Design a protein around this ligand. Sequence first.
Ligand SMILES: O=C(O)CNC(=O)c1nc(-c2cccc3ccccc23)ccc1O
Ligand SMILES: [Zn+2]
Length: 441
Amino acid sequence: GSHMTPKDDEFYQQWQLKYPKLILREASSVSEELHKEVQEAFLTLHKHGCLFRDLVRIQGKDLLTPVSRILIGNPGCTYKYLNTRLFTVPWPVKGSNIKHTEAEIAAACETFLKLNDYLQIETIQALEELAAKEKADEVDIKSRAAYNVTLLNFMDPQKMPYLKEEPYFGMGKMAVSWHHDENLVDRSAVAVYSYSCELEGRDPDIWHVGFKISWDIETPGLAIPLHQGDCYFMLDDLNATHQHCVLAGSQPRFSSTHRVAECSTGTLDYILQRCQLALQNVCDDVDNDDVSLKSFEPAVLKQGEEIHNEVEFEWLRQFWFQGNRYRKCTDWWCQPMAQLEALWKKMEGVTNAVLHEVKREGLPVEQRNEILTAILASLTARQNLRREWHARCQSRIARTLPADQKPECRPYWEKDDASMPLPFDLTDIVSELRGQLLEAK
Ligand SMILES: O=C(O)CNC(=O)c1nc(-c2cccc3ccccc23)ccc1O
Ligand SMILES: [Zn+2]
């Protein structure tokens, strides 16, 4: 089990033969102005403390990433990985009015937008070249380079020295283990700008990106040295056929990883449209607590309860688990989250209305049982997911974080709370409904 670096004769040919959708643009091909702007933007976002270690979940374990991160991108866009939905700090894309940041921060976002445009152009060029090599559509290519977000990383290996050893090729210390990037548009490229501050095998003191073939530890892995401002590109199916990792050096290092996030169910607009659809079933002359529904058709109720779950667990809890970090950097999401929370509270109202109907004196049991069968999976999931999020929020690792990042379990209410129609813990309700469904016939 071994690896190759530029110091190996076989390196270049092995790069050609087993890893040709991996492209490398050395810092030289990038303008000094852009380097400067980008690097000052990294340092800027670092000074203002905008990068946070994520509290992710892997194989059922709550883990703090060694790396500090922040997501920057199109307004209203999210990127979900390791069960953790990141919300963009917005950059000023076309027809945008952010009005949300502290001067320097905004300028940094603008910069990473500029970086994004450049890397996009380079990715398009390289993908052209690749298709032309293949020769020996255009919309597809522009589509696979349309980076809508960048995920920024920082790590100081001197302050963060608790790093695993690369287990298969002897590549040494890993900042990030072997993985595929999730939640990307199919066959979409990833473009990385790497900014490192200042013998057998790979140089331990220099940062590398490592690549291997999926399922395969026989084919030697590649360890690519990254210096200051080097760029690399994972093109086409590389991210699917291969795995990559980050090999830490000794100095601090920043990176900007530009992605086409698969946000078809990952944007504010999308989840507001979903909420609007759920509340089509609600009589909406006035906003009060007397929620009354237009139909108890099972399909409509199932849909409603499914959307309720989606806005609660994919949006509100995800957002508040992060402890309102990035309020530091922008207030963009404050109103939208308030709005999604109000919509969700109304849906608590809807559920209550269904539970009210299910108990109604003159409701024929057949219709009742149709309703129960329609909503039960949703309520069961709501209960299990609430147990999970509550536990995730209270975990030992979670309580150790600063007060500026303390996982707020939200929304959360006590039974003594008369403002909420339904209890947080639905155990008894789900029991009753199941009991009802199995009554003698
Ligand atoms: O810095 C580099 O040169 C390489 N960056 C990443 O690979 C990277 N990968 C992920 C990532 C995305 C999706 C799923 C993952 C699963 C495990 C580890 C990283 C993952 C996140 C931030 C990153 O910076
Ligand atoms: Zn990755």
